[PDB]
Structure formats: structure tokens, C-alpha cells
Design a protein around this nucleic acid. Structure first.
Ligand code: MG
Ligand code: ZN
Ligand code: ZN
Ligand code: ZN
Lengths: 97, 112, 554, 177, 171, 87, 270, 107
DNA sequence: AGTACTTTTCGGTCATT
RNA sequence: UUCGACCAGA
DNA sequence: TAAGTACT
């Protein structure tokens, strides 16, 4: 079935935080990607076996994170990139506030 | 005084029908419309232009148009918006998520 | 989610840094040269040429290989590729600025058109808001069309101070299709119309100052004006433009995979002109073609008509189109999704449930499942459900062990067998009193979605209590309703502790309760009241028995 | 992995990874000015062999102790004495530590926490940088040349005579065997 | 050369172990994933000091599984050779391409052609060696090398050193 | 970061546990309990985690700490023990 | 629209209403920090009523045979008559109830005295009543000091905001004022003894409850009030099924759009 | 304060901000016939010392931007004549709690 | 300154690519 | 799969 | 349907 926009706004109202996620992630999309702790991208060439990780270019192998985001969102990003736009995914805020 | 009117008028629209809404609601809205400076409209023209992140406004009326000028002016998004997280698959800072929980190792001993 | 452990630490996204790809970066990232426009058939031989899709990029045919990255299909997200263009092209969406920028700076030297020297400018240089400086700056120098070399400082208008030089008059500019053209006024008379070559624009930008960027809504690290022009083109990997196979010996390519195919073609053709019979300007008749495709690929709903129809007259899904509001990604994939653990049917009233319940049909209860974790507290009960099977009602239909592997209870040669292990999970059937989220769209209320108690019942309908009718705003003239099932011990909590119907009784939207008594029960509660109305023993006894909490005191 | 008390704001262009040479230019992770947990500043911590042998032993020991509060609820002679301290408070599969103790205990230059102390009190009047004030401690040096040449970061930081005196008091403190 | 750097690490504890002596388990695991590790930005982690005052701080419960994550702050003894660093160690392996010295937890290798000339290589020796006019280098023989360059890798670090300068060789 | 940590004194938030807090503490705790975590109350025969939680939460024997963040980023720390539970 | 425009608004732990920027939109949710759900239409008795009748009800004069509490009500009835130190509190009280009157009449000019307010006091007493089987016959046992000095001690505990300073604690007083008017309205000496014969027990109870009750009606930092407020308005907007003004739905549309050329423009000049 | 009748010449007004610190203001007669602050709706405003303001901020942990704003040309902003940066405290009546304290910074 | 244009506005069937 | 039409509904 | 901006 469909947990559309309104069905969200509702849980938001309810304050039913986690449930909202559970609907959005675990019971739907939910995907695990790897990022470069330098250039917030999906670049990372994760061989999840020989634990190699790399990311030539920003050239890494050390600073690499892993995250969970809706596949659709991955796509959103990749799509945006295909449009030459860069959406950086950083795992730590540096702008304070 | 404008707020005072903008409210009064909105209140009336809901009274004419013989319905009732607790001040606070109409207030809040009438307020969001005002604070900023004058009469900010509830439309892609107004509010969806504020300093709010990109990803957030991104989800209403202008999407791509908005995203494009986001990376072109290298914006930075806080990810404090309900939307922001929903798009990332993270727990939004909302009710249940307006705080964190921890295992106090100390108190975890007095208990036994 | 995703499966297969990764020694990589896991965090949550905290910031989203928006930028623009620098040709140099695009190259570094890519793992594919992408020279050929073809798809595969190494001469019909099935596979994939080191040309387009997978010249090292992602895959298909259910085959590990993703640059050894293996893992295969599910897990290996895409790996961007690139495609070195022939000559710089605009960015269909940026044209607006690229233009509005030139109008802010003069060519040849490439520098601002209003220094701290002009006071009106000062004011426009204190405003801290990329979107606003650049909106005021522009309004200020869009008018002046003479790269002043000497201006009257903060003193006498008599004395003239110097700065940058080259008064080369500034041409006003207008937009014709995907190209920028401007006229240079000559005094003595008559204009001078010439097309602004990208090659040219791009350059004037490359030379704009470091502090000049910034002054104008930009960012030295993430978005230099010079990047609004495409030199290198990132190539989205299959997963963005997947195929569709009808087994084998057929096709199935995606819209995008074609516009690249075109862009590619239109690019090569160009190249083979500047290294061959180059009738100088019989080329810019084929360089506009690249600017076109590389434009339409991203946006295809422009002003200059030509829809770039694909043989058969079908429009062509531009990337932009995929994100555009409603029905698309952002709004229809992210802000709202289709989900699992959900059911819907026809609702009908039942004067025999408590308010906070909801009758679920056995049919569904046996379909919907809740993952429970084998615990000493339950081991017993759980093992019984498992045994019971996925056909009997109180039962379960999936046992999952630590070894991240699913035991399909309805087939597994061991269904009857199996002893659970503390720590295993046993997806079981929904059971009497499993908190669930019930709802009737359109949902425009906290209450349009409330937590009910699951009461497994016969017959095919969600049977809801009457009094909880007005909140959802539902009738039974064939009205349907949606049920969602929680999944984590904590998720339920969130429903039961905040969304449970008993809780919604009084609403803040009008500081008064939001459910009451209707139809029969109401109409009858009046009659049953009247002075005139009396009741005799035999019955007053049955009526008493009915209020479940009767203290048994006639 | 194991982060290190200093969030260096990496803004995209990670390119300047200088060289590592006895130009007292050690990775950013080893500037003379590093940060302590308390949040305070503190000089780098350079350990010359045998001084390290003591810090390790000292912790490996006081571990075996607090590893029993909870339990309830001569050269060749030290090799055996240490092997045990490991097969008691070590991971045993820390083949490195084993090998670091042999080495660390074989090429060491001091046995008394009193002798290593004076060595320090001594070199710590030089104003030299931690890395030098280490090598000097763990490397035999008879001439100002054997020194000012195996530790080229010194060269102009100390008069040969002066550095020669220091070298004297070292062989004079150098515990026997 | 050996250092005492201040580090930190994040451990994800399963609710299982939310016992009475959790602290105990944490530390325990701290050590499982550090003492013996290796990096290019820290090099050889050898020993966690001050086992007792290890800071755990309040760990926060993740939010899908009760696993909690504490930022175990600690301090330990590290060691990462450098280029131009002079160290002496015991030789270990020795072939026709050079011998390999073992400076602590690391192995520094010296090339046949990175030594002097009057020092040739004797094959028919038992055990294998390198002879000189007055010097002889083989297994147990102690050498003092100058690490020309470093190469990090996996969970170890190797490097090539020379004995062609002065005050370099046997002892 | 500690300048962003407010002292147990000077504390200013609500002395009582917010409905979302308890909502989450119970869930969170329930979850952990269901994970075979240790239970700090004698189960009077109970066997449902959220039920055990509700119990732990009433004898205020729950080792959790609610960290309340403020708009500017600084937070306050309260303990299920402290927090009053009206509702 | 309404929604998307107020998603990000919620009450933060400081009891301020903000959005994702931290932009205060309301300093106290709804100008009072009370959760809509805990509210009922009460009547501020102190408002209406002839200046004459106002006295006959709230006025107490211990120095007058005809304006004192007849000892048939209070236990220490006869031993009070005349006392001058009490008539000071007793007068302080009245000067206040009166200050109140004028205040309300400055806020609710319509004279309308029924308003939504946390803590239903009427009922809270109604219970106090039949909970202690209070007899409208025998005399109370309250000190006039008992009453007046505890009602004052109550207001001190109806805390909405907490802050340890002036700017904050000054807001506190603000976001409570109206409620208290209603409070003193119903806990005035004369009333407390003649209208609802409370005993010390009753009164000390009625107090304790009002406090707790109040403290529950506050708003929980966490509430996503924005989406709430949005819906609360937008919901009854759908139900709108349809003197010559612009009307409902089209008008609301006209308002949210902030349109320069509104169909009906009008303007009422008194 | 200069009170013009029907208008001032665009040649003159561009002479006000040319002599700081001092400041000048231009008011039309027809606009001052009635005092707007006397209107039923308009609640009373109040200037705040750069002392009282640096406070409001500290007490709410606000940054200048997160504060509600009033227009540099807002009728009442002129009546009192604020300056980009000055804060006005708006105190009004309320059907939820007698009085409500609000703050408006300026742009 | 007027006219045209764009956006925004919870199931199965048929036909063609 | 996609577009489009219809529908059908509440 | 109907309004509002941006655009011709
Ligand atoms: Mg219906
Ligand atoms: Zn990278
Ligand atoms: Zn791959
Ligand atoms: Zn120029």
C-alpha cells in the first residue's frame, strides 16, 4: 500500500518519530552505501571482503564511512550528480549553531 | 496591527462556518506569516524562499529549479528539518526524537 | 539492510554540501572512458563493450563483476563514468546565471564592473546572503556597459583615480534558444551582433577573480562560476538508467541510456570535423547539436519548443523530469513511499468491539507478520507458533537465525523440526492485541491515523468501532481503509503510547473531545432515558449483565 | 579506527601530505604542539628505548594488579620475567608487543627508574625537540659527529663541545650489564 | 621515536552486555581492537597505558537496536618509524639481495646495493652471511640502520634502510 | 564541547518527563529487554518486554539518561530516576 | 501548503516555538504554553456583573456589622470582627480582585467572560464537595489567613517557564496572569466560605489538585505543533460545504495568497 | 525631524546621510494628522538599550537572526525611529493569558 | 501592460512503443 | 517498465 | 477552476 505525504505529516504531528522512519526505511527502501570522509560522495569502491575501500581521486582508503539511506535517496543523489550537481554527505557538522 | 488583522480575518473565515479552532493554531500560522518582516505569503513565492535548507524547500513546488541553484551557490543544509531527514532515512528531531538517550554506567550498578 | 558486514564505521548524515562538479573531479571519479555509443554485442556476441554501460562500470546478467567490486547487482551502487566532450556546453539549467554573470563582468580582462569605489555598490557588498548580493549587484551593473578605467574617488569629482583597465565597451545580452548573443554599440552608429562562443564565455569566467567569485554568490571550493559550463560529462551507471530484459535475444534499454547514446554520437561527429574537412562554420551547425542533446538530457521542458521527441513521438524523460514534483522521486519516492507490512479492505461497523480495537480478518492476520526475538520468556510459545505452521491461524511463517539466513516455514524440509535459539527471530502472525496503525485517507488529521488493538475475526472486513468513525471520517457505503504493522519493540511503543485511539479522544484542534455517540446508540440513548420509559426485572437483569464492569449489584 | 584528539577540518582538497624526514617534520599527527584529553596543550611525547621499556612494563604491571582486584569477583633474567607479565595481561596474539619487549629490553640503556630520570633531567635542559631528545638517549654516541650526523636535526642547535659533554655524562650514567 | 599519543575509539555494545560490569567488558574490547593494531597515521599501537582511568563517558543508545556506542577515550604507546630515522635492530632474514633488520615491532630491510662495496655476499655459508675485511654480518648480528623510506601496509610497516653512511653498520 | 554541556545545577528544563520521552524510554528499554538485556526488577511473572519496561519504569529502575538538547545546541541531562512521571 | 509551510515548527525544550532555523516564531506556545487538549470554557466571574453585585460577593469588611463574615460561616467568626491586621489582607485582596476586573475589561472589551482556560476549577471543587461530604450547615475552620495566604502561595507554583533570572521569570508571570485572574476569581474569601463551604481539608485539597492539574496542562517540549496547527485549520477547511462579503474557502485562499486585489475590499469606519 | 507639506525635492533628500553621527528624518503632514499608535489594534512597542538587548539574546540563547523582525520603514518603527539593529519589545493583550511579551529586531 | 503559460490541484483495461 | 485513454470508485 | 509570476 502507500505511506504517502499526508500519512507522514500525520506521524510527524503524532511525534511518532521512530515509527515514521521504520515506515520509510526498514519497511521499504533502506539501503547501505559507503562515503568518502573527504568528498561527500558515493565514489568509494567498497570490496566488502578484502576490506579494501579506496576512492581514487579524493584518493582514500582510510577515512570512509558507511550509511543507511533510502535507495530512492541514493538515486536522487546519483541523478543529481548525472546533472553535474554535487550533494555532499558529511557525517559531522562543522558549521556549529 | 497587521498580524492582529490577518488573524482576525482568518478567524472569521472559520467562524462563518460555525466551526471553532483554538486561537493558538490560527495564531501560530498568522505568526509564521508575519515575524520575518511583513506579510510573507503561504506560497512558493514567499515562505518556500526563506533561509531554510534546500532539501526541505526542495520538496514543494520548485524541486529541481531549487536544487540547481543550491549547488551553484554551494549551500549547506543543516538537516534539522523534518523533511531533510525523511529524505535521508534518519530519525527526525521530532517529539520522540527531540533528544537522546544514554546508558548511565554509574546508575547501572546501584541497580542490583 | 543491504546485508554483508562492513568494517566501515557507520554514521548519520549531518550536513549536505551542495556544489558543482569540476571537470577535473568528474574525471578522477569515473571508472569508464566511455568512447563508444553502442550498448553491447561485441559483434552480436552478447556481453558489454568497454564503450557505454560497463566499460568497467556496474553490471547486469546476474554476474558479480563490478570492477571485481563483485557483490553484484544488489549492493554495488553505480560507479560514475565520464565522457570528455568536444567543446564546452552550457548547463541547460544554469544558462540563466551564466548569462546574468556576464552581464555583471566584462570580457577580455574579466573582472567586476563596480568596485568599492562606487558607493551604491558598497551597500550591496555588506549584504550577507549569496542570493541577495548577487541579486542587487546584478541590478546595479546590468545597466553600465563601459568597463570604467578611471573613477572619481571619495574626494573631488575633479580628480580621477585609476584601477583595472580596458574600456572595451560591454555588450548588452539577450537569450535566443541555448545561445547567448549581444550587441556592441559603436559611436561616431549601428550595432554589431555576434554569437558568444561557450569557449569564450568559459574563459572570461576562468579569469574572474578569487574575491570576485565570492562577492557574487559563489564558493571557491564547491562552486566556481566557471563550472556552470560543461567540459566533462559524468555518466550515470546502469542503476540510474537500468534496462528491462524479456529473457534474452531482445533489448530493453532506458530513455537516458539513449540520450547519452545521442550525446555521445553528436559529440564524436563533431570531433571528426575539427581534424578533417573543416568548413570552419559548417561545424557550429553541429556543435549546436551537442549543446542541444547535452541540454535536453537534463531538462526537456523548455521554452524553445523542440521537444527532442524520440522516434514515435514520445517526449523523452529528462533527468529533471524524474524529480519534478509529485509522482516523482523527491515527492513520490522519498517524502512518500509504498511500503511493506500493510493491508487494506472494506470497513464496516461492529457494535461489539471496544473503541480502541479493530477487527482484522484471519485472511490478513495470516499474511501480515511481526518479527519477534526468541527469548526465554517466550521460547515456548514461539516454538509452538512455528510448529503450528503458516496456515493455521495463531502461527508463524518465517524463522531467521543469527547467520543472516531465512528459514521459509512453508517449504523447508525442517519446518516440523527446528528448535529455536535465544537470539533468533520468528516472524509470526499478527495476534490479538498487536498494536497497529489504522487509517482512512485523505489523512489531514492527527486522528486520520490511530493505533488500534488487533482483534482477529472471521469474514473479510476491517471492523472498526462506531464512535471512532467520525475521526477517520468514514462511512460503510463501501469505504476502504489502510492498516500498517509496526516492527520493532520500540515502534509499537510509539503507537501504543501516542497514537492509541483512547488517547485521541480529546483534540487540541478544538479543545473538546473528537468522538462521541451516533446513530442507534445515540438515538436510542435518548429513548431509553425519558421519564416515561420504564424497564422490568427480567430485562433490567440482562441489561446489567451487559455492562462488563457491573459490580453485580442489582 | 581510532580518531586522534584534533578534528582537522578537511575541506575537500586533501593534497599537501608533506614528506616525513628528520627535518623534524613528522606527520601532522606529531607536531610539537598536540592536544591532551583534558583539552589542554602539551608537548609531544618522545620515548627513547629503555625509557619505553619502563613505561610499558609499568602499565603492563599495574594492569595485572587491577586484573585481580576483580579476579576475586639481569638481562637474560628479564626475558623470562617479562614473558610472564604478557601471558597474564596481554592478548598473547599481540605478537608485536612480545617482539617490542625483546627489542625494547635488549637494546635498552637503563634499568633504574632513577637512572632514566637523570637522563631526562639532563637532556631536558637542551631546549631541543622531543624527537632528538630521544635518539640522543637511545643511541650510543662517542663523538659530536656520530651524534650531529645520525640526528641531522641537531646540526646548528648545539655546540659540539656542549653536545660532547652531554655524551660524556650519558656513558657515565649508562647502567652496566 | 616511540611515542605516547592520546587517542579515542568508538565501540558499539550490544544490549546483551548492558550488565553490571559493563565498563569491564568495554575496556576488555578496547584492548582487543587496539593493542596490536597498525595505521599510517598512528603506526604501531602497542600498549594501552593507565588501564584503570580509561574514560568511557556516557555511551548513547543507538536507535533501531539497543546497541549503545561509547567514545572510549584513552592513551597509549605508539611507534611509527620515519624516513631519515636512525635505528639499530637485530638482523632476521638474510639473502642475496640483502639482510633484514628488525627494529622493534617492525622489519627494516637493507639492499645488497645499499650497503658498502667491500662488503660482498657469501652464499656457501651456514648460516648465510655478508663478509668484509674485518666485519661479518649474519643472523643474530646487531646492526644500526638508517631508514631511507617508509611503506605502510595492512597491519604492519616496512621500510628500506642503508648502512652506507658513516657510524652505520655493526657494533 | 564541554562548553555545550550544562551543569546538573543551573538546570532549567521541565522537572517532569515529557510524554515522548517516556514513550521512547519504554520503547527503547523494551527493545533492549527483548534483546536479552538484563532486567532490573523481579518479573512478577511478566513476560512481555514493554510490560517489563513499564515495570522497570515505575520502580524507576531504568539505567537510562535523557539528554535534552536546546535550540542553540547545548544540552541538559536528566535520569529516568530524577524525572517525575505524572501522566 | 499550510502544512509544508509549518512542518519544521515545534516547541523546543526552552518552551519556545521555533522552526528549523531556530527562529522564534512564538516565545511561548500559543502565548501561554498550554497544550490545547487540556482546556475548557470557563467563566471569569470577576468580569460581568454590576459594580453593585461585585461587592455583595467578593467584599469582606471585618469592621462592620453588615459587611463582615457572619460567624455562622467561619469558625473564628466572632473573634475576628474588628481585627485590624486582617482587614489589611482582606483589603489587599479586594484591591486586587478589583485591579483584575479593570484588567479583564481592558483585554476582553466585548464583555464576553467565557474563555478556554487550563484547569477546570468549577469541577475541581464540585468534587472537593461530595468527596468530603461537606455540610452547608456547620461552620468552616479556615483562618482568613489560611485562605488568602495559600491562594497566594499557589500562584507561585503554577510554573509554565522555569528560568533562573528576571527576563525569564518575568515571562512566567505574563503567561499566567489570565489564569490567575480566574484563580483569585474563584478562591476569594467570601466565595470560599459562603458559596462553597470548604473546610481546611477541602481547600488544601482543591489547592493541591489545581497545581498538579495545571502543571499537566503545560505543553510537552517535543510536540510538533506546526503540522498540528496546520491541520487543525486546514482540516475544517475541507468540511466547508457551500452579509455580502467574500465568504469562506475562496476567501481563505485569498488570505493565504495575500492577494493585492481582493474581490471584496470593504472597510468599517466607526 | 523635518515636516514637509506636499513633498520634498529628490535633489534635497540626498543630503541627510551626509553628516554623521547626527541623523535626520522626513515626515509628511497628512501622515501625522492621526497618531497610529493610538489605534485599537496597534499594541505598544518599546526600544531596548543595547544593554537590554544583549540580554534578551543571552537569556534565550538567540542569535540576532532568529529574532522576529520589524521593517526599517514600519509605521511604528518610524514613530519611535529605530535603527538597523535596535530591538523593540512588543507587549500586547492575549485571549490566552492577559499579556504577552514579544520582541522585534530591525532590518 | 496585456496575453499566454505553468504549477499545483487514494484499483483494473486497452493499445502501442 | 513507459505514455496515454478509460474507468471505476470512496 | 483560478491566481500569480515571469515573459513576450
Ligand atoms: Mg463514503
Ligand atoms: Zn573521495
Ligand atoms: Zn561495483
Ligand atoms: Zn575589462
Amino acid at each position: 500500500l502507500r505511506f504517502g505525504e499526508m500519512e507522514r505529516d500525520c506521524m510527524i504531528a503524532h511525534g511518532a518519530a521512530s515509527f515514521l522512519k521504520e515506515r520509510l526505511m526498514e519497511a521499504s527502501d533502506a539501503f547501505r552505501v559507503h562515503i568518502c570522509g573527504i568528498c561527500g560522495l558515493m565514489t568509494v569502491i567498497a570490496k566488502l571482503n578484502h576490506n579494501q575501500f579506496e576512492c581514487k581521486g579524493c584518493d582514500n582508503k582510510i577515512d570512509i564511512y558507511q550509511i543507511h539511506i533510502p535507495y530512492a535517496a541514493k538515486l536522487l543523489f546519483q541523478e543529481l550528480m548525472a546533472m553535474n550537481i554535487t550533494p555532499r554527505l558529511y557525517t559531522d557538522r562543522s558549521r556549529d549553531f | 496591527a497587521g498580524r492582529a488583522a490577518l488573524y482576525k480575518e482568518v478567524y472569521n473565515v472559520i467562524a462563518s462556518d460555525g466551526s471553532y479552532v483554538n486561537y493558538r493554531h490560527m495564531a501560530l500560522l498568522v505568526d509564521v506569516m508575519t515575524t520575518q518582516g511583513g506579510l510573507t505569503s503561504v506560497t512558493r513565492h514567499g515562505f518556500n524562499r526563506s533561509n531554510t535548507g534546500a532539501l526541505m524547500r526542495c520538496s514543494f513546488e520548485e524541486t529541481v529549479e531549487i536544487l540547481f541553484e543550491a549547488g551553484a551557490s554551494a549551500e549547506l543544509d543543516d538537516c534539522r528539518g523534518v523533511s531533510e531527514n525523511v529524505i535521508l532515512g534518519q530519525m527526525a528531531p521530532i517529539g520522540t526524537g527531540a533528544f537522546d538517550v544514554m546508558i548511565d554506567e554509574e546508575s547501572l550498578v546501584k541497580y542490583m | 539492510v543491504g546485508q554483508q558486514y562492513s568494517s566501515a564505521p557507520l554514521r548519520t548524515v549531518k550536513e549536505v554540501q551542495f556544489g558543482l562538479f569540476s571537470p577535473e573531479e568528474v574525471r578522477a571519479i569515473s571508472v569508464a572512458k566511455i568512447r563508444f555509443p553502442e550498448t553491447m554485442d561485441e559483434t552480436q556476441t552478447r556481453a558489454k563493450i568497454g564503450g557505454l554501460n560497463d566499460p568497467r562500470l556496474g553490471s547486469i546478467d546476474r554476474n558479480l563483476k563490478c570492477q571485481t567490486c563483485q557483490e553484484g547487482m544488489n549492493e554495488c551502487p553505480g560507479h560514475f563514468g565520464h565522457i570528455d566532450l568536444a567543446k564546452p556546453v552550457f548547463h541547460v539549467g544554469f544558462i540563466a546565471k551564466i548569462k546574468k554573470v556576464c552581464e555583471c563582468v566584462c570580457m577580455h580582462c574579466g573582472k567586476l564592473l563596480l568596485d568599492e569605489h562606487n558607493e551604491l555598490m558598497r551597500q550591496a557588498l555588506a549584504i550577507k546572503d549569496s542570493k541577495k548580493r548577487f541579486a542587487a549587484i546584478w541590478t546595479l551593473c546590468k545597466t553600465k556597459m563601459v568597463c570604467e578605467t578611471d573613477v572619481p574617488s571619495e574626494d573631488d569629482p575633479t580628480q580621477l583615480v585609476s584601477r583595472g583597465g580596458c574600456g572595451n565597451t560591454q555588450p548588452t545580452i539577450r537569450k535566443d534558444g541555448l545561445k547567448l548573443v549581444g550587441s556592441w554599440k559603436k559611436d561616431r552608429d549601428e550595432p554589431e551582433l555576434r554569437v558568444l562562443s561557450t569557449e569564450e564565455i568559459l574563459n572570461i569566467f576562468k579569469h574572474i577573480s578569487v574575491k570576485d567569485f565570492t562577492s557574487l554568490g559563489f564558493n571557491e571550493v564547491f562552486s566556481r562560476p566557471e563550472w556552470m559550463i560543461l567540459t566533462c560529462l559524468p555518466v550515470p551507471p546502469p542503476p540510474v538508467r537500468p534496462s528491462i530484459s524479456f529473457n534474452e535475444s531482445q533489448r530493453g534499454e532506458d530513455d537516458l541510456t539513449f540520450k547519452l547514446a545521442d550525446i555521445l554520437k553528436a559529440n564524436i561527429s563533431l570531433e571528426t570535423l575539427e581534424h578533417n574537412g573543416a568548413p570552419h562554420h559548417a561545424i557550429e551547425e553541429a556543435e549546436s547539436l551537442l549543446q542541444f542533446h547535452v541540454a535536453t538530457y537534463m531538462d526537456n521542458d523548455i521554452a524553445g519548443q523542440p521537444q527532442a521527441l524520440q522516434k514515435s513521438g514520445r517526449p523523452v524523460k529528462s533527468i529533471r523530469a524524474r524529480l519534478k514534483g509529485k509522482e516523482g522521486r523527491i515527492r513520490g519516492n522519498l517524502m512518500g513511499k509504498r511500503v511493506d507490512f500493510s493491508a487494506r479492505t472494506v470497513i464496516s461497523g461492529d457494535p461489539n468491539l471496544e473503541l480502541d480495537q479493530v477487527g482484522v480478518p484471519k485472511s490478513i492476520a495470516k499474511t501480515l507478520t511481526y518479527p519477534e526475538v526468541v527469548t526465554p520468556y517466550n521460547i515456548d510459545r514461539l516454538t509452538q507458533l512455528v510448529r503450528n505452521g503458516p496456515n493455521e491461524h495463531p502461527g508463524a511463517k518465517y524463522v531467521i537465525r543469527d547467520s543472516g539466513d531465512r528459514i521459509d516455514l512453508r517449504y523447508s524440509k525442517r519446518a516440523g523440526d527446528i528448535q529455536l535459539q535465544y537470539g533468533w527471530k520468528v516472524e509470526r502472525h499478527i495476534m490479538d492485541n498487536d498494536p497497529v496503525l489504522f487509517n482512512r485517507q485523505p489523512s489531514l488529521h492527527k486522528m486520520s491515523m490511530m493505533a488500534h488493538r488487533v482483534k482477529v475475526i472471521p469474514y473479510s472486513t476491517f471492523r472498526l468501532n462506531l464512535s471512532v468513525t467520525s475521526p477517520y471520517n468514514a462511512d460503510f457505503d463501501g469505504d476502504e481503509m489502510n492498516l500498517h504493522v509496526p516492527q520493532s519493540e520500540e515502534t509499537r511503543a510509539e503507537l501504543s503510547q501516542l497514537c492509541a485511539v483512547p488517547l485521541q479522544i480529546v483534540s487540541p484542534q478544538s479543545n473538546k473531545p473528537c468522538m462521541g455517540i451516533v446513530q442507534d446508540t445515540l438515538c436510542g440513548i435518548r429513548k431509553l432515558t425519558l421519564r416515561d420509559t420504564f424497564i422490568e426485572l427480567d430485562q433490567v437483569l440482562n441489561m446489567l449483565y451487559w455492562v462488563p464492569d457491573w459490580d453485580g449489584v442489582i | 579506527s581510532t580518531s586522534t584528539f584534533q578534528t582537522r577540518r578537511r575541506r575537500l582538497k586533501k593534497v599537501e601530505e608533506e614528506e616525513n624526514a628528520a627535518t623534524l617534520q613528522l606527520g601532522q599527527e606529531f607536531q610539537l604542539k598536540q592536544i591532551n584529553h583534558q583539552g589542554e596543550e602539551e608537548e609531544l611525547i618522545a620515548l627513547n628505548l629503555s625509557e619505553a621499556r619502563l613505561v610499558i612494563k609499568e602499565a603492563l604491571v599495574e594492569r595485572r594488579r587491577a586484573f585481580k582486584r576483580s579476579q576475586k569477583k639481569t638481562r637474560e633474567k628479564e626475558l623470562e620475567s617479562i614473558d610472564v607479565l604478557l601471558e597474564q595481561t596481554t592478548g598473547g596474539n599481540n605478537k608485536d608487543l612480545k617482539n617490542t619487549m625483546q627489542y625494547l629490553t635488549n637494546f635498552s640503556r637503563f634499568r633504574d627508574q632513577e637512572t632514566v630520570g637523570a637522563v631526562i633531567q639532563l637532556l631536558k635542559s637542551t631546549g631541543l625537540h622531543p624527537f632528538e631528545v630521544a635518539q640522543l638517549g637511545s643511541l650510543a654516541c662517542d663523538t659530536a659527529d656520530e651524534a650531529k650526523t645520525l640526528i641531522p636535526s641537531l646540526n646548528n642547535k648545539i655546540s659540539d663541545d656542549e653536545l660532547e659533554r652531554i655524551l660524556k655524562e650519558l656513558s657515565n650514567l649508562e647502567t652496566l650489564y | 621515536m616511540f611515542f605516547i599519543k592520546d587517542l579515542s575509539l568508538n565501540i558499539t555494545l550490544h544490549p546483551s552486555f548492558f550488565g553490571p560490569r559493563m565498563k569491564q567488558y568495554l575496556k576488555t574490547k578496547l584492548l582487543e581492537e587496539v593493542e596490536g593494531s597498525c595505521t599510517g597515521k598512528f603506526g604501531y599501537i602497542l600498549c594501552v597505558l593507565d588501564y584503570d582511568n580509561i574514560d568511557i563517558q556516557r555511551g548513547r543508545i543507538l536507535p533501531t537496536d539497543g546497541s549503545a556506542e561509547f567514545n572510549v577515550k584513552y592513551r597509549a604507546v605508539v611507534f611509527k618509524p620515519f624516513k631519515g630515522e636512525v635505528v639499530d635492530g637485530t638482523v632476521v632474514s638474510c639473502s642475496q639481495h640483502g639482510f633484514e633488520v628488525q627494529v622493534g615491532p617492525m622489519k627494516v630491510f637493507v639492499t645488497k646495493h645499499l650497503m658498502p662495496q667491500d662488503l660482498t655476499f657469501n652464499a656457501g655459508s651456514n648460516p648465510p652471511s655478508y663478509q668484509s675485511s674485518e666485519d661479518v654480518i649474519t643472523i643474530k648480528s646487531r646492526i644500526r640502520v638508517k631508514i631511507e623510506g617508509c611503506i605502510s601496509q595492512v597491519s604492519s610497516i616496512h621500510a628500506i634502510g642503508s648502512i652506507k653512511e658513516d657510524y652505520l653498520g655493526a657494533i | 564541547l564541554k562548553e555545550k554541556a550544562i551543569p546538573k545545577d543551573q538546570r532549567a528544563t521541565t522537572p517532569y518527563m515529557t510524554k515522548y520521552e517516556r514513550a521512547r524510554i519504554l520503547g527503547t528499554r523494551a527493545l533492549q529487554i527483548s534483546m536479552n538485556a538484563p532486567v532490573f526488577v523481579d518479573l512478577e511473572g511478566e513476560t512481555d518486554p514493554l510490560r517489563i519496561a513499564m515495570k522497570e519504569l515505575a520502580e524507576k529502575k531504568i539505567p537510562l539518561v535523557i539528554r535534552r538538547y536546546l535550540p542553540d545546541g547545548s544540552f541538559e541531562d536528566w535520569s529516568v530516576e530524577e524525572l517525575i512521571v505524572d501522566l | 501548503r499550510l502544512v509544508k509551510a509549518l512542518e519544521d515548527i515545534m516547541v523546543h525544550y526552552d518552551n519556545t516555538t521555533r522552526n528549523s532555523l531556530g527562529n522564534v516564531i512564538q516565545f511561548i506556545y500559543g502565548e501561554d504554553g498550554m497544550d490545547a487538549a487540556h482546556i475548557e470554557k470557563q467563566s471569569l466571574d470577576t468580569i460581568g456583573g454590576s459594580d453593585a453585585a461585585f461587592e455583595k460577593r467578593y467584599r469582606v469588611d471585618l469592621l462592620n456589622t453588615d459587611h463582615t463574615l457572619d460567624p455562622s460561616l467561619l469558625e473564628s467568626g466572632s473573634e475576628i470582627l474588628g481585627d485590624l491586621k486582617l482587614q489589611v489582607l482582606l483589603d489587599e485582596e479586594y484591591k486586587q480582585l478589583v485591579k483584575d476586573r479593570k484588567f479583564l475589561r481592558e483585554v476582553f472589551v466585548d464583555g464576553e467572560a467565557n474563555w478556554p482556560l487550563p484547569v477546570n476549577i468549577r469541577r475541581i471543587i464540585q468534587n472537593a464537595q461530595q468527596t468530603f461530604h461537606i455540610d452547608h450547615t456547620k461552620p468552616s475552620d479556615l483562618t482568613i489567613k489560611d485562605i488568602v495566604l495559600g491562594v497566594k502561595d499557589l500562584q507561585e507554583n503554577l510554573l509554565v517557564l522555569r528560568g533562573k533570572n528576571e527576563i525569564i521569570q518575568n515571562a512566567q508571570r505574563d503567561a499566567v496572569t489570565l489564569f490567575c485572574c480566574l484563580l483569585r476569581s474563584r478562591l476569594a474569601t467570601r466565595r470560599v466560605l459562603q458559596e462553597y463551604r470548604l473546610t481546611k481539608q477541602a481547600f488544601d485539597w482543591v489547592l493541591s489538585n489545581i497545581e498538579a492539574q495545571f502543571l499537566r496542562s503545560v505543553v510537552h517540549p517535543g510536540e510538533m505543533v506546526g503540522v498540528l496547527a496546520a491541520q487543525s485549520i486546514g482540516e475544517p477547511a475541507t468540511q466547508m460545504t457551500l452579509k455580502k462579503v467574500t465568504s469562506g474557502v475562496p476567501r481563505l485562499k485569498e488570505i493565504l495568497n495575500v492577494a493585492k486585489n481582493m474581490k471584496t475590499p470593504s472597510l468599517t469606519v466607526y | 525631524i523635518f515636516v514637509y507639506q506636499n513633498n520634498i525635492t529628490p535633489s534635497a533628500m540626498k543630503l541627510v546621510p551626509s553628516i554623521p553621527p547626527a541623523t535626520i528624518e522626513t515626515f509628511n503632514e497628512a501622515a501625522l494628522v492621526v497618531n497610529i499608535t493610538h489605534h485599537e489594534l496597534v499594541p505598544k512597542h518599546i526600544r531596548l538599550s543595547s544593554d537590554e538587548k544583549r540580554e534578551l539574546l543571552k537569556r534565550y540563547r538567540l542569535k540576532e537572526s532568529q529574532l522576529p523582525r520589524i521593517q526599517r520603514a514600519d509605521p511604528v518603527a518610524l514613530y519611535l525611529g529605530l535603527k538597523r539593529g535596535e530591538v523593540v519589545k512588543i507587549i500586547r493583550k492575549s485571549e490566552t493569558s492577559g499579556r504577552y511579551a514579544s520582541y522585534r529586531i530591525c532590518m
